[PDB]
Write a protein that binds this ligand. Structure first.
Ligand code: U5P
Length: 234
């Protein structure tokens, strides 16, 4: 249903104040659907076609953010053509414009922030940026008692130069543990338990920075992000 005041739009598009945008409007210099609009409060709907001094001001759709609970057997990109993308779950216009701010492997489930906001996304995904992801990891063999520390100090991924930046591991059950990592390498958790001689059976992402997965968002389900959620991300 997204829409906005015509002035607020001319404002954003021109890099001027809404107060001045309003002015330019009464100056008979703003057009909608090929007609002169002198009202600053005009309700600008997507199907409209705005123009400034004859020049068409491309309607840059507002940005969207969504919380998804990724189910198994689906991927977060089209890089692979053997599995359907998680887009099969987003009933939204031009959904294809959305990208996962942090992809989840085909059989990993949990919080996946679908967004078409490049700036926002990058700040969450940059390899240089400290962002905390917290997973619920199910293990083949009871977590080794000395694993805990090993993760805090750090482990060396098989054939990797550096060490995994300190991670805190909590023990829910002998074989189920919650893991928090501020990094984001490729298949990092799986390989981490690899180094310490264990195997990841299941893997669920609960948190990304300041956004946590709702307790009642069934896998496959999603929902727009809350104003606070956007601003708080990390
Ligand atoms: O510590 C981590 C973080 C992520 N992943 C998994 O690795 C993936 C990233 O690779 P890709 O989804 O871009 O192919 C995440 O999707 C998730 O399933 C892990 O095994 N360990």
């Amino acid at each position: 249903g997204s829409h906005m005041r015509l002035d607020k739009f001319i404002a954003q598009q021109l890099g001027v104040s809404r107060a001045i945008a309003g002015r330019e409007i009464r100056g008979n210099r703003v057009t909608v659907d090929g007609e002169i609009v002198r009202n600053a409060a005009f309700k600008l709907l997507p199907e409209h076609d705005v123009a400034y001094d004859g020049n068409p001001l491309a309607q840059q759709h507002g940005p969207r953010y969504f919380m998804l609970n990724k189910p198994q057997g689906y991927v977060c990109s089209t890089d692979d053509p053997d599995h359907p993308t998680v887009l099969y779950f987003l009933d939204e216009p031009v959904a294809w414009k959305l990208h996962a701010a942090g992809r989840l492997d085909i059989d990993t489930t949990g919080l996946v922030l679908m967004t078409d906001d490049g700036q926002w996304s990058h700040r969450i995904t940059s390899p240089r940026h400290h962002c905390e992801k917290t997973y619920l990891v199910t293990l083949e063999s009871p977590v080794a008692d000395d694993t805990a520390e090993q993760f805090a100090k750090g482990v060396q991924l098989h054939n990797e130069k550096d060490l995994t930046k300190p991670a805190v591991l909590e023990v829910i059950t002998p074989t189920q543990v919650r893991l928090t990592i501020s990094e984001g390498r490729y298949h990092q958790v799986k390989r981490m338990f690899a180094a310490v001689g264990n195997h990841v059976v299941e893997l669920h992402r609960e948190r990304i920075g300041g956004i946590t997965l709702d307790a009642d968002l069934a896998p496959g389900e999603y929902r727009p992000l809350t104003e606070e959620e956007i601003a708080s991300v990390v």
